[PDB]
Amino acid sequence: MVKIRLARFGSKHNPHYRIVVTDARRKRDGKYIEKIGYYDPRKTTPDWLKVDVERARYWLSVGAQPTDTARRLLRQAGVFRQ
Amino acid sequence: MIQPQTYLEVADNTGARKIMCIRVLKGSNAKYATVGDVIVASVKEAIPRGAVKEGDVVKAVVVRTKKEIKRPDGSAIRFDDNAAVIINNQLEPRGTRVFGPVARELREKGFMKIVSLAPEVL
Amino acid sequence: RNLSALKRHRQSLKRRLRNKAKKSAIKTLSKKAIQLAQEGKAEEALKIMRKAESLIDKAAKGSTLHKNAAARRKSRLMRKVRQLLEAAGAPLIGGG
Amino acid sequence: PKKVLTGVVVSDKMQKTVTVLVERQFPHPLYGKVIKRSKKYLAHDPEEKYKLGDVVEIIESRPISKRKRFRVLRLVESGRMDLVEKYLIRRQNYESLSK
RNA sequence: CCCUCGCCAAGGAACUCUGCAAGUUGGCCCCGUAACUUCGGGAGAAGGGGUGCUCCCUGGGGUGAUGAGCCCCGGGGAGCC
RNA sequence: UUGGAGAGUUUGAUCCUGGCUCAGGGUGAACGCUGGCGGCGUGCCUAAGACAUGCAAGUCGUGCGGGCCGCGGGUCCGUGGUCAGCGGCGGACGGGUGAGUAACGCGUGGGUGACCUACCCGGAAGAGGGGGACAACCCGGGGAAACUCGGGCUAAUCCCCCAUGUGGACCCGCCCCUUGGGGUGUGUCCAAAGGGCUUUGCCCGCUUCCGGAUGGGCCCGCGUCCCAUCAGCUAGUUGGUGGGGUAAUGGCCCACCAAGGCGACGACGGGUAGCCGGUCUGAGAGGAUGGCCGGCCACAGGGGCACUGAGACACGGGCCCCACUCCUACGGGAGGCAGCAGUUAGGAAUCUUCCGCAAUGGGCGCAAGCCUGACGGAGCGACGCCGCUUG
RNA sequence: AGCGCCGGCCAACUCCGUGCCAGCAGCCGCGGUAAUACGGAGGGCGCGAGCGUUACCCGGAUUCACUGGGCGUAAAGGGCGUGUAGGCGGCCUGGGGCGUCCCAUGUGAAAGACCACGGCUCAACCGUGGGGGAGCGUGGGAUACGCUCAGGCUAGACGG
RNA sequence: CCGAGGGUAGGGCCCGUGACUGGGGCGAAGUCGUAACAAGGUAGCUGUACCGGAAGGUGCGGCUGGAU
Ligand SMILES: [Mg+2]
Ligand SMILES: [Mg+2]
Ligand SMILES: [Mg+2]
Ligand SMILES: [Mg+2]
Ligand SMILES: [Mg+2]
Ligand SMILES: [Mg+2]
Ligand SMILES: [Mg+2]
Ligand SMILES: [Mg+2]
Ligand SMILES: [Mg+2]
Ligand SMILES: [Mg+2]
Ligand SMILES: [Mg+2]
Ligand SMILES: [Mg+2]
Ligand SMILES: [Mg+2]
Ligand SMILES: [Mg+2]
Ligand SMILES: [Mg+2]
Ligand SMILES: [Mg+2]
Ligand SMILES: [Mg+2]
Ligand SMILES: [Mg+2]
Ligand SMILES: [Mg+2]
Ligand SMILES: [Mg+2]
Ligand SMILES: [Mg+2]
Ligand SMILES: [Mg+2]
Ligand SMILES: [Mg+2]
Ligand SMILES: [Mg+2]
Ligand SMILES: [Mg+2]
Ligand SMILES: [Mg+2]
Ligand SMILES: [Mg+2]
Ligand SMILES: [Mg+2]
Ligand SMILES: [Mg+2]
Ligand SMILES: [Mg+2]
Ligand SMILES: [Mg+2]
Ligand SMILES: [Mg+2]
Ligand SMILES: [Mg+2]
Ligand SMILES: [Mg+2]
Ligand SMILES: [Mg+2]
Ligand SMILES: [Mg+2]
Ligand SMILES: [Mg+2]
Ligand SMILES: [Mg+2]
Ligand SMILES: [Mg+2]
Ligand SMILES: [Mg+2]
Ligand SMILES: [Mg+2]
Ligand SMILES: [Mg+2]
Ligand SMILES: [Mg+2]
Ligand SMILES: [Mg+2]
Ligand SMILES: [Mg+2]
Ligand SMILES: [Mg+2]
Ligand SMILES: [Mg+2]
Ligand SMILES: [Mg+2]
Ligand SMILES: [Mg+2]
Ligand SMILES: [Mg+2]
Ligand SMILES: [Mg+2]
Ligand SMILES: [Mg+2]
Ligand SMILES: [Mg+2]
Ligand SMILES: [Mg+2]
Ligand SMILES: [Mg+2]
Ligand SMILES: [Mg+2]
Ligand SMILES: [Mg+2]
Ligand SMILES: [Mg+2]
Ligand SMILES: [Mg+2]
Ligand SMILES: [Mg+2]
Ligand SMILES: [Mg+2]
Ligand SMILES: [Mg+2]
Ligand SMILES: [Mg+2]
Ligand SMILES: [Mg+2]
Ligand SMILES: [Mg+2]
Ligand SMILES: [Mg+2]
Ligand SMILES: [Mg+2]
Ligand SMILES: [Mg+2]
Ligand SMILES: [Mg+2]
Ligand SMILES: [Mg+2]
Ligand SMILES: [Mg+2]
Ligand SMILES: [Mg+2]
Ligand SMILES: [Mg+2]
Ligand SMILES: [Mg+2]
Ligand SMILES: [Mg+2]
Ligand SMILES: [Mg+2]
Ligand SMILES: [Mg+2]
Ligand SMILES: [Mg+2]
Ligand SMILES: [Mg+2]
Ligand SMILES: [Mg+2]
Ligand SMILES: [Mg+2]
Ligand SMILES: [Mg+2]
Ligand SMILES: [Mg+2]
Ligand SMILES: [Mg+2]
Ligand SMILES: [Mg+2]
Ligand SMILES: [Mg+2]
Ligand SMILES: [Mg+2]
Ligand SMILES: [Mg+2]
Ligand SMILES: [Mg+2]
Ligand SMILES: [Mg+2]
Ligand SMILES: [Mg+2]
Ligand SMILES: [Mg+2]
Ligand SMILES: [Mg+2]
Ligand SMILES: [Mg+2]
Ligand SMILES: [Mg+2]
Ligand SMILES: [Mg+2]
Ligand SMILES: [Mg+2]
Ligand SMILES: [Mg+2]
Ligand SMILES: [Mg+2]
Ligand SMILES: [Mg+2]
Ligand SMILES: [Mg+2]
Ligand SMILES: [Mg+2]
Ligand SMILES: [Mg+2]
Ligand SMILES: [Mg+2]
Ligand SMILES: [Mg+2]
Ligand SMILES: [Mg+2]
Ligand SMILES: [Mg+2]
Ligand SMILES: [Mg+2]
Ligand SMILES: [Mg+2]
Ligand SMILES: [Mg+2]
Ligand SMILES: [Mg+2]
Ligand SMILES: [Mg+2]
Ligand SMILES: [Mg+2]
Ligand SMILES: [Mg+2]
Ligand SMILES: [Mg+2]
Ligand SMILES: [Mg+2]
Ligand SMILES: [Mg+2]
Ligand SMILES: [Mg+2]
Ligand SMILES: [Mg+2]
Ligand SMILES: [Mg+2]
Ligand SMILES: [Mg+2]
Ligand SMILES: [Mg+2]
Ligand SMILES: [Mg+2]
Ligand SMILES: [Mg+2]
Ligand SMILES: [Mg+2]
Ligand SMILES: [Mg+2]
Ligand SMILES: [Mg+2]
Ligand SMILES: [Mg+2]
Ligand SMILES: [Mg+2]
Ligand SMILES: [Mg+2]
Ligand SMILES: [Mg+2]
Ligand SMILES: [Mg+2]
Ligand SMILES: [Mg+2]
Ligand SMILES: [Mg+2]
Ligand SMILES: [Mg+2]
Ligand SMILES: [Mg+2]
Ligand SMILES: [Mg+2]
Ligand SMILES: [Mg+2]
Ligand SMILES: [Mg+2]
Ligand SMILES: [Mg+2]
Ligand SMILES: [Mg+2]
Ligand SMILES: [Mg+2]
Ligand SMILES: [Mg+2]
Ligand SMILES: [Mg+2]
Ligand SMILES: [Mg+2]
Ligand SMILES: [Mg+2]
Ligand SMILES: [Mg+2]
């Protein structure tokens, strides 16, 4: 199904993800439907995570599925806060 | 019953398609070759870029004849064509494959390779 | 030198049988009603034609027929029969 | 939207089909001058009500035949045999262009 | 043994001065047809498909009368040995 | 307005014309001489030649019945494991290659009242009762192997019938619409599967229907190389009617009817080429190019074919033909690296038979988790750029 | 620490050896007993873990010229008419608004590219944010020019 | 029925190759003459035709891009 996950960008030993909504059948770094934030697992910068919480909730609502460690990061941005 | 002038189908993948017997190699004056006999022949038709070409003088063993061949058990066998497999002077096939059935007489005359490569031995 | 691709192939041959079976049966009873309707014979046509439609939608439960193919096939059946019975009439049953 | 085209009917020798010549202009991509190019579309005429020389509009449509992807939309003008003749004179000139 | 004739396993011009002789081919309908050419031809080039009988449907012509009958030239289906 | 340099060379000398030549930048490069380190890239453009060996797609016992071992204990029971089997789901993604293709293949903007979409999400309703088969297993016959054939039993989320009809499907009439869009009336037709826990409650599933979202198919306008020493091409050809076929339009396919369709705005034919985002160059215009990354297309030794399926005419699925190769006990069998490595051949020339699923992602699973040569990394090469040393 | 080069273009000069030989060469050209041009040496110039060479692409090449060329004698006017298609077309007024111009709007994926900031000690590389554009879809607007339809005109052309 | 392909026959295009043959380019240290550039010793050039070892000649017509 359509999914919300981490497309790796950046470079070798310098991981930089764009948390993204794409068809599951896409290649990991392939054309995606929309970008809804970034993530820098190494915290090399003050904001190593951003999430358009507005847009993310929409995709969730309309049937998208987060990966586990995307849902983790999506949690940290409080998309699931009721 | 193959003799000089007789055309034979070649039942291998050497590239020869038709050969014309010019001698039966069986003594000083054998009249006819049958299955298991060797002939010298001219290559009369050949597909492009084969191992043998038109005009070549080759040796071959007769593996099929239209004249029925008689067996000691009182049976006989006969084919629709006269066919040969092109060989070298070790009686070894110059090709890698042989097509169509071949007569079992080949085995006894020492053409083991050819007999085993054949799809059927009758 | 092996796989569950083998399993998948075995399964396809069993599903193969069933799809053909249903499809044949549908084709038979379809043309049958149409033949009756031709010389209609209204009650008999519709009786058989009722049986064809059943086998059709039943085929579309599973993989045999797509719903639209079923819809298409029913449409042509009923369209054919009515137009055929129209040479003479009268429709003795349903439907419709 | 469905594409709408204007042109002349240069053939009606077909059953329920007319041939509509359509012209377009544009500046040459490199040499700038404005140039003319034309194209013939096979148009659906279910009433066979369209006559040679009619200026019509055709609208992009679901396939009717192999090569027919346009219906005739409406009449625009009539009796443009003057245009039809320019098409025909050129085709006529082609016998002179062989060897 | 000779003449005229018929058939022949496998081979298929190996015959002979020479395929001499003898085979092959062979009518009609249809498809199709090269170099070259003086544009006529070459051409029946070559090569190939069809061919009987039965039933059903049908198109024109001649004689009648415009019709039946007779006679002529076709066409399309489905079959049988 | 951030952007534009020229020089050598025809003469005894001159101006002009004109070609040749050079200085610049660029490369998936190669060759010579030389060669210390590191990072990030990057590396068969030739034979889409041929390939030894391993690996590149599996998972689920919370769908089912068993074989073997094992743990607990009373042959039975639980249970754990293992193994295949039956049944799901994935295997149509991901990965490779650029042969073919001058095409609606691609780019771009549009159409579909002519269409499909598994899993996911939201909303509506529902799961009543019967019956049957095939493997496993057993028993035989046949093999060197591939494996195989026959008879006999047995379960299920396997198959079938009946009911129920929320609803949907189809014919005909009516209203709205306006290409086959929505609504309604009679008839006719169609549902289902259970499992697991902590057990009159839950979770995972199953069923019909509307919708959403995602992914697609088809169609259209315009753009897409060279040769006119290729100038005429066309019988499924162009249109119609009717059928067949599809998810759906269409000569897509068929039957008949008509004689049309296309071309100097280059048809037809020949040659070359996968196309684009981009890339290199250039003052710009333009020229050149499309490897690496991204998107789309096409192919899976050559060719045809359909089956299963939501989706394939399917790289590591099936059938057949061909070419080629191999095994054999000589009776017969097997194979498809343009997946990752690796071999050989060809070439001026192009890499390790490495590590790991820790991350990211994908499949299956309630979950643990399993699989993942995608991937993350390590190896080799001054191949490229960048940084550093020999003070 | 190496590689190329030191006649001119083009930055870097002397001695010896050779004597139209051996050889160099991208073009022009060097070599025939005092060679900055061959071979070595000293010296010098230029780059530096590289330096040179071959191949190919764009540039210099306004040398296919749209921007931005030409045809008396340099390469270049068809031997000459006639005329088909096509290209192009006088003065005035109105309709339409096709080209053309303007505004709004959708599309123009990500990467790359350009400006800024930031992360690997810098860089390469990589992350984050920013600004566009042509082109095409749609909506509204303008009418000079070109087009088209209509009506006049006489200066072109034709006729008496 | 269609159908991969196979077979028979006949055409079309392209490539490689061929005894021999035609001319061409380059070489140059040769042989023959000297056609053109001066009025180049016959002004030149030209289309065509016929001819000659060769450059070339001559006819017919044309051009001046001809010296005096
Ligand atoms: Mg054979
Ligand atoms: Mg020969
Ligand atoms: Mg399985
Ligand atoms: Mg039947
Ligand atoms: Mg179905
Ligand atoms: Mg139609
Ligand atoms: Mg007599
Ligand atoms: Mg005989
Ligand atoms: Mg005979
Ligand atoms: Mg013969
Ligand atoms: Mg013969
Ligand atoms: Mg003789
Ligand atoms: Mg003799
Ligand atoms: Mg003779
Ligand atoms: Mg004779
Ligand atoms: Mg005869
Ligand atoms: Mg006869
Ligand atoms: Mg005769
Ligand atoms: Mg001939
Ligand atoms: Mg002759
Ligand atoms: Mg002739
Ligand atoms: Mg004949
Ligand atoms: Mg002849
Ligand atoms: Mg015949
Ligand atoms: Mg017959
Ligand atoms: Mg008779
Ligand atoms: Mg008879
Ligand atoms: Mg009479
Ligand atoms: Mg009569
Ligand atoms: Mg400027
Ligand atoms: Mg310059
Ligand atoms: Mg000079
Ligand atoms: Mg000069
Ligand atoms: Mg000089
Ligand atoms: Mg110059
Ligand atoms: Mg360079
Ligand atoms: Mg090197
Ligand atoms: Mg070395
Ligand atoms: Mg590293
Ligand atoms: Mg490296
Ligand atoms: Mg290779
Ligand atoms: Mg390759
Ligand atoms: Mg090869
Ligand atoms: Mg090989
Ligand atoms: Mg493994
Ligand atoms: Mg387990
Ligand atoms: Mg299992
Ligand atoms: Mg599947
Ligand atoms: Mg795939
Ligand atoms: Mg792929
Ligand atoms: Mg990859
Ligand atoms: Mg690779
Ligand atoms: Mg390609
Ligand atoms: Mg082509
Ligand atoms: Mg398009
Ligand atoms: Mg196009
Ligand atoms: Mg598009
Ligand atoms: Mg499925
Ligand atoms: Mg049971
Ligand atoms: Mg029911
Ligand atoms: Mg389950
Ligand atoms: Mg139709
Ligand atoms: Mg389909
Ligand atoms: Mg067609
Ligand atoms: Mg037909
Ligand atoms: Mg006809
Ligand atoms: Mg056109
Ligand atoms: Mg052209
Ligand atoms: Mg080609
Ligand atoms: Mg290609
Ligand atoms: Mg320039
Ligand atoms: Mg290209
Ligand atoms: Mg490339
Ligand atoms: Mg790519
Ligand atoms: Mg293929
Ligand atoms: Mg294949
Ligand atoms: Mg291969
Ligand atoms: Mg294959
Ligand atoms: Mg199916
Ligand atoms: Mg495919
Ligand atoms: Mg493979
Ligand atoms: Mg597969
Ligand atoms: Mg397959
Ligand atoms: Mg083996
Ligand atoms: Mg083995
Ligand atoms: Mg054995
Ligand atoms: Mg077999
Ligand atoms: Mg293997
Ligand atoms: Mg490989
Ligand atoms: Mg090698
Ligand atoms: Mg080699
Ligand atoms: Mg390798
Ligand atoms: Mg690598
Ligand atoms: Mg993993
Ligand atoms: Mg995971
Ligand atoms: Mg899951
Ligand atoms: Mg659990
Ligand atoms: Mg595995
Ligand atoms: Mg591995
Ligand atoms: Mg890697
Ligand atoms: Mg390095
Ligand atoms: Mg240098
Ligand atoms: Mg000097
Ligand atoms: Mg310099
Ligand atoms: Mg200097
Ligand atoms: Mg010397
Ligand atoms: Mg030198
Ligand atoms: Mg001197
Ligand atoms: Mg000296
Ligand atoms: Mg020098
Ligand atoms: Mg020197
Ligand atoms: Mg460096
Ligand atoms: Mg250049
Ligand atoms: Mg230029
Ligand atoms: Mg110009
Ligand atoms: Mg000039
Ligand atoms: Mg002029
Ligand atoms: Mg001149
Ligand atoms: Mg003139
Ligand atoms: Mg004129
Ligand atoms: Mg005119
Ligand atoms: Mg005009
Ligand atoms: Mg004007
Ligand atoms: Mg006006
Ligand atoms: Mg106006
Ligand atoms: Mg306008
Ligand atoms: Mg825009
Ligand atoms: Mg962009
Ligand atoms: Mg920094
Ligand atoms: Mg810009
Ligand atoms: Mg507009
Ligand atoms: Mg006027
Ligand atoms: Mg006047
Ligand atoms: Mg006058
Ligand atoms: Mg065929
Ligand atoms: Mg064929
Ligand atoms: Mg075959
Ligand atoms: Mg010669
Ligand atoms: Mg003279
Ligand atoms: Mg003289
Ligand atoms: Mg003179
Ligand atoms: Mg003369
Ligand atoms: Mg002479
Ligand atoms: Mg003489
Ligand atoms: Mg004379
Ligand atoms: Mg004269
Ligand atoms: Mg004159």
mmCIF file of all heavy atoms in Angstrom, chain F residues 325-332:
data_model
loop_
_atom_site.group_PDB
_atom_site.id
_atom_site.type_symbol
_atom_site.label_atom_id
_atom_site.label_comp_id
_atom_site.label_asym_id
_atom_site.label_seq_id
_atom_site.Cartn_x
_atom_site.Cartn_y
_atom_site.Cartn_z
ATOM 1 P P U F 325 28.068 -27.788 -28.866
ATOM 2 O OP1 U F 325 29.499 -27.878 -29.274
ATOM 3 O OP2 U F 325 27.061 -28.772 -29.340
ATOM 4 O "O5'" U F 325 27.956 -27.803 -27.276
ATOM 5 C "C5'" U F 325 28.739 -26.935 -26.476
ATOM 6 C "C4'" U F 325 28.348 -27.022 -25.020
ATOM 7 O "O4'" U F 325 26.971 -26.601 -24.844
ATOM 8 C "C3'" U F 325 28.393 -28.408 -24.399
ATOM 9 O "O3'" U F 325 29.702 -28.791 -24.023
ATOM 10 C "C2'" U F 325 27.435 -28.277 -23.223
ATOM 11 O "O2'" U F 325 28.070 -27.654 -22.120
ATOM 12 C "C1'" U F 325 26.379 -27.327 -23.790
ATOM 13 N N1 U F 325 25.233 -28.081 -24.324
ATOM 14 C C2 U F 325 24.262 -28.404 -23.411
ATOM 15 O O2 U F 325 24.348 -28.059 -22.249
ATOM 16 N N3 U F 325 23.206 -29.121 -23.913
ATOM 17 C C4 U F 325 23.047 -29.538 -25.217
ATOM 18 O O4 U F 325 22.047 -30.182 -25.526
ATOM 19 C C5 U F 325 24.109 -29.168 -26.105
ATOM 20 C C6 U F 325 25.152 -28.467 -25.641
ATOM 21 P P C F 326 30.101 -30.343 -23.903
ATOM 22 O OP1 C F 326 31.566 -30.380 -23.720
ATOM 23 O OP2 C F 326 29.507 -31.122 -25.012
ATOM 24 O "O5'" C F 326 29.409 -30.797 -22.548
ATOM 25 C "C5'" C F 326 29.787 -30.189 -21.324
ATOM 26 C "C4'" C F 326 28.833 -30.552 -20.223
ATOM 27 O "O4'" C F 326 27.494 -30.144 -20.590
ATOM 28 C "C3'" C F 326 28.705 -32.036 -19.938
ATOM 29 O "O3'" C F 326 29.744 -32.511 -19.105
ATOM 30 C "C2'" C F 326 27.316 -32.151 -19.317
ATOM 31 O "O2'" C F 326 27.338 -31.841 -17.933
ATOM 32 C "C1'" C F 326 26.552 -31.049 -20.052
ATOM 33 N N1 C F 326 25.713 -31.587 -21.141
ATOM 34 C C2 C F 326 24.435 -31.997 -20.770
ATOM 35 O O2 C F 326 24.108 -31.882 -19.578
ATOM 36 N N3 C F 326 23.599 -32.499 -21.706
ATOM 37 C C4 C F 326 24.005 -32.597 -22.967
ATOM 38 N N4 C F 326 23.134 -33.101 -23.838
ATOM 39 C C5 C F 326 25.313 -32.185 -23.375
ATOM 40 C C6 C F 326 26.139 -31.691 -22.438
ATOM 41 P P C F 327 30.043 -34.084 -18.998
ATOM 42 O OP1 C F 327 31.268 -34.220 -18.165
ATOM 43 O OP2 C F 327 29.969 -34.664 -20.368
ATOM 44 O "O5'" C F 327 28.805 -34.680 -18.186
ATOM 45 C "C5'" C F 327 28.686 -34.490 -16.788
ATOM 46 C "C4'" C F 327 27.461 -35.182 -16.251
ATOM 47 O "O4'" C F 327 26.285 -34.671 -16.924
ATOM 48 C "C3'" C F 327 27.393 -36.682 -16.482
ATOM 49 O "O3'" C F 327 28.151 -37.420 -15.542
ATOM 50 C "C2'" C F 327 25.893 -36.964 -16.438
ATOM 51 O "O2'" C F 327 25.413 -37.022 -15.103
ATOM 52 C "C1'" C F 327 25.332 -35.703 -17.085
ATOM 53 N N1 C F 327 25.069 -35.876 -18.528
ATOM 54 C C2 C F 327 23.883 -36.505 -18.904
ATOM 55 O O2 C F 327 23.119 -36.907 -18.012
ATOM 56 N N3 C F 327 23.613 -36.655 -20.224
ATOM 57 C C4 C F 327 24.485 -36.207 -21.142
ATOM 58 N N4 C F 327 24.187 -36.374 -22.439
ATOM 59 C C5 C F 327 25.709 -35.565 -20.773
ATOM 60 C C6 C F 327 25.956 -35.419 -19.466
ATOM 61 P P U F 328 28.926 -38.754 -15.997
ATOM 62 O OP1 U F 328 29.658 -39.306 -14.817
ATOM 63 O OP2 U F 328 29.646 -38.466 -17.265
ATOM 64 O "O5'" U F 328 27.751 -39.769 -16.337
ATOM 65 C "C5'" U F 328 26.820 -40.148 -15.341
ATOM 66 C "C4'" U F 328 25.744 -41.013 -15.928
ATOM 67 O "O4'" U F 328 24.882 -40.214 -16.780
ATOM 68 C "C3'" U F 328 26.234 -42.112 -16.846
ATOM 69 O "O3'" U F 328 26.760 -43.234 -16.160
ATOM 70 C "C2'" U F 328 24.998 -42.398 -17.684
ATOM 71 O "O2'" U F 328 24.046 -43.138 -16.936
ATOM 72 C "C1'" U F 328 24.449 -40.987 -17.878
ATOM 73 N N1 U F 328 24.968 -40.374 -19.117
ATOM 74 C C2 U F 328 24.221 -40.546 -20.288
ATOM 75 O O2 U F 328 23.169 -41.161 -20.340
ATOM 76 N N3 U F 328 24.739 -39.967 -21.420
ATOM 77 C C4 U F 328 25.918 -39.253 -21.495
ATOM 78 O O4 U F 328 26.262 -38.788 -22.584
ATOM 79 C C5 U F 328 26.632 -39.125 -20.249
ATOM 80 C C6 U F 328 26.151 -39.676 -19.126
ATOM 81 P P A F 329 27.808 -44.203 -16.901
ATOM 82 O OP1 A F 329 28.652 -44.878 -15.877
ATOM 83 O OP2 A F 329 28.460 -43.420 -17.983
ATOM 84 O "O5'" A F 329 26.871 -45.289 -17.597
ATOM 85 C "C5'" A F 329 27.197 -46.674 -17.583
ATOM 86 C "C4'" A F 329 26.012 -47.515 -17.165
ATOM 87 O "O4'" A F 329 25.898 -47.508 -15.716
ATOM 88 C "C3'" A F 329 24.656 -47.058 -17.701
ATOM 89 O "O3'" A F 329 23.825 -48.203 -17.892
ATOM 90 C "C2'" A F 329 24.104 -46.228 -16.546
ATOM 91 O "O2'" A F 329 22.693 -46.099 -16.542
ATOM 92 C "C1'" A F 329 24.627 -47.009 -15.335
ATOM 93 N N9 A F 329 24.824 -46.219 -14.110
ATOM 94 C C8 A F 329 25.225 -44.906 -13.967
ATOM 95 N N7 A F 329 25.323 -44.510 -12.716
ATOM 96 C C5 A F 329 24.975 -45.643 -11.978
ATOM 97 C C6 A F 329 24.878 -45.897 -10.589
ATOM 98 N N6 A F 329 25.136 -44.986 -9.648
ATOM 99 N N1 A F 329 24.499 -47.137 -10.188
ATOM 100 C C2 A F 329 24.242 -48.060 -11.126
ATOM 101 N N3 A F 329 24.297 -47.943 -12.455
ATOM 102 C C4 A F 329 24.672 -46.700 -12.825
ATOM 103 P P C F 330 24.030 -49.167 -19.161
ATOM 104 O OP1 C F 330 22.898 -50.134 -19.141
ATOM 105 O OP2 C F 330 25.430 -49.680 -19.201
ATOM 106 O "O5'" C F 330 23.801 -48.202 -20.405
ATOM 107 C "C5'" C F 330 22.504 -47.695 -20.714
ATOM 108 C "C4'" C F 330 22.493 -46.941 -22.026
ATOM 109 O "O4'" C F 330 23.120 -45.638 -21.849
ATOM 110 C "C3'" C F 330 23.229 -47.618 -23.184
ATOM 111 O "O3'" C F 330 22.536 -47.345 -24.404
ATOM 112 C "C2'" C F 330 24.581 -46.903 -23.189
ATOM 113 O "O2'" C F 330 25.252 -46.920 -24.431
ATOM 114 C "C1'" C F 330 24.179 -45.486 -22.777
ATOM 115 N N1 C F 330 25.253 -44.723 -22.124
ATOM 116 C C2 C F 330 25.638 -43.477 -22.637
ATOM 117 O O2 C F 330 25.059 -43.021 -23.635
ATOM 118 N N3 C F 330 26.633 -42.790 -22.029
ATOM 119 C C4 C F 330 27.235 -43.297 -20.951
ATOM 120 N N4 C F 330 28.212 -42.592 -20.371
ATOM 121 C C5 C F 330 26.862 -44.565 -20.420
ATOM 122 C C6 C F 330 25.876 -45.240 -21.024
ATOM 123 P P G F 331 21.676 -48.503 -25.116
ATOM 124 O OP1 G F 331 22.299 -49.806 -24.742
ATOM 125 O OP2 G F 331 21.499 -48.157 -26.553
ATOM 126 O "O5'" G F 331 20.256 -48.442 -24.403
ATOM 127 C "C5'" G F 331 19.391 -47.331 -24.573
ATOM 128 C "C4'" G F 331 18.284 -47.347 -23.552
ATOM 129 O "O4'" G F 331 18.814 -47.667 -22.245
ATOM 130 C "C3'" G F 331 17.529 -46.041 -23.372
ATOM 131 O "O3'" G F 331 16.484 -45.975 -24.333
ATOM 132 C "C2'" G F 331 17.040 -46.101 -21.918
ATOM 133 O "O2'" G F 331 15.759 -46.705 -21.852
ATOM 134 C "C1'" G F 331 18.055 -47.041 -21.247
ATOM 135 N N9 G F 331 18.975 -46.419 -20.262
ATOM 136 C C8 G F 331 19.140 -46.919 -18.989
ATOM 137 N N7 G F 331 20.007 -46.269 -18.268
ATOM 138 C C5 G F 331 20.473 -45.269 -19.115
ATOM 139 C C6 G F 331 21.439 -44.246 -18.876
ATOM 140 O O6 G F 331 22.098 -44.003 -17.865
ATOM 141 N N1 G F 331 21.623 -43.436 -19.980
ATOM 142 C C2 G F 331 20.969 -43.582 -21.178
ATOM 143 N N2 G F 331 21.316 -42.693 -22.127
ATOM 144 N N3 G F 331 20.068 -44.534 -21.427
ATOM 145 C C4 G F 331 19.857 -45.347 -20.359
ATOM 146 P P G F 332 15.664 -44.634 -24.681
ATOM 147 O OP1 G F 332 14.469 -45.099 -25.439
ATOM 148 O OP2 G F 332 16.529 -43.630 -25.326
ATOM 149 O "O5'" G F 332 15.141 -44.096 -23.274
ATOM 150 C "C5'" G F 332 15.111 -42.709 -22.973
ATOM 151 C "C4'" G F 332 15.762 -42.452 -21.639
ATOM 152 O "O4'" G F 332 17.195 -42.652 -21.748
ATOM 153 C "C3'" G F 332 15.641 -41.050 -21.069
ATOM 154 O "O3'" G F 332 14.373 -40.780 -20.490
ATOM 155 C "C2'" G F 332 16.798 -41.015 -20.078
ATOM 156 O "O2'" G F 332 16.482 -41.762 -18.909
ATOM 157 C "C1'" G F 332 17.867 -41.790 -20.850
ATOM 158 N N9 G F 332 18.768 -40.891 -21.606
ATOM 159 C C8 G F 332 18.777 -40.628 -22.953
ATOM 160 N N7 G F 332 19.698 -39.786 -23.316
ATOM 161 C C5 G F 332 20.332 -39.445 -22.125
ATOM 162 C C6 G F 332 21.411 -38.552 -21.871
ATOM 163 O O6 G F 332 22.045 -37.856 -22.673
ATOM 164 N N1 G F 332 21.730 -38.511 -20.516
ATOM 165 C C2 G F 332 21.095 -39.232 -19.529
ATOM 166 N N2 G F 332 21.546 -39.065 -18.275
ATOM 167 N N3 G F 332 20.096 -40.066 -19.755
ATOM 168 C C4 G F 332 19.769 -40.119 -21.063
#
